[PDB]
Amino acid sequence: TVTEQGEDITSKKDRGVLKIVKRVGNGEETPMIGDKVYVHYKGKLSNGKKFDSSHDRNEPFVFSLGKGQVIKAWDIGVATMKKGEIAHLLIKPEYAYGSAGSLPKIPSNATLFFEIELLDFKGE
Ligand SMILES: COc1cc2cc(OC)c1OC/C=C/COCCOC(=O)[C@@H]1CCCCN1C(=O)[C@H]2C1CCCCC1
């Protein structure tokens, strides 16, 4: 395998967000912009120095798709997913925290990795 694998799901096609479907989902609907979305996730910096998971909070993570409550990669990435799907996302800094970073958690120009399971979504 290669590092830069997965489908480029960016609009600009700059391979900034690469997606692999690891578990196929059910039903033909993906969420609409503005839908409330319910997920479980495991995330990390590619340097392995930091890790975050919804399981640490012992409850699904909920956000409104496409409202910028999460990094760009998530708004783009979760919009592509079916209910029940598990996907991996490899994310360059331009679709995460950029050259400014987000200290102390996220250094400048960080690459991020997430596994996300789309549990459900509801039209608000
Ligand atoms: C567990 O707490 C955090 C988790 C992430 C980022 C954080 O601040 C940048 C962060 O600090 C508290 C702030 C939370 C508010 O949302 C920040 C935006 O977070 C995000 O957009 C993405 C996706 C949704 C789950 C959290 N996200 C994060 O990047 C995590 C990081 C934490 C470090 C490992 C890689 C993931």
Q: Domain extents for the chain?
A: 1-124
Are the CB atoms for 93 and 110 separated by under 8 Å?
yes
Ligand 1 centre from 86 Cα, in Å? 19
Report the residue among 45, 50, 52, 90 best suited for mutation to probe ligand 1: largest number of ligand atoms under 8 A from its CB: 52
The dihedral region occupied by 68, where left means phi > 0, alpha psi between -120 and 50, and beta the remainder, is left
- Between CA 52 and CA 11 the distance in angstroms is 27
Report the C-alpha gap between 93 and 66 in whole angstroms: 18
- The rounded Å distance from CA 65 to ligand 1 centre is 16
User: Number of C-alpha atoms within 13 angstroms, CB side, residue 86?
Assistant: 6
**Experimental determination approach used:** X-ray
Resolution given for this structure, in angstroms: 1.8
121 is catalytic: no
Number of other residues whose CB lies within 10 A of the CB of residue 103 = 9
Cβ atoms of 80 and 9 closer than 8 Å: yes
Closest ligand 1 atom, residue 41 Cα? 25
Spell out the SS3 assignment of 84-113: CCEEEEEECHHHCCCCCCECCCECCCCCEE
Give dist(CA 8, CA 11) in Å, integer.
9
**Rounded to an integer, what distance in angstroms lies between the CA atom of residue 102 and that of residue 88?**
22
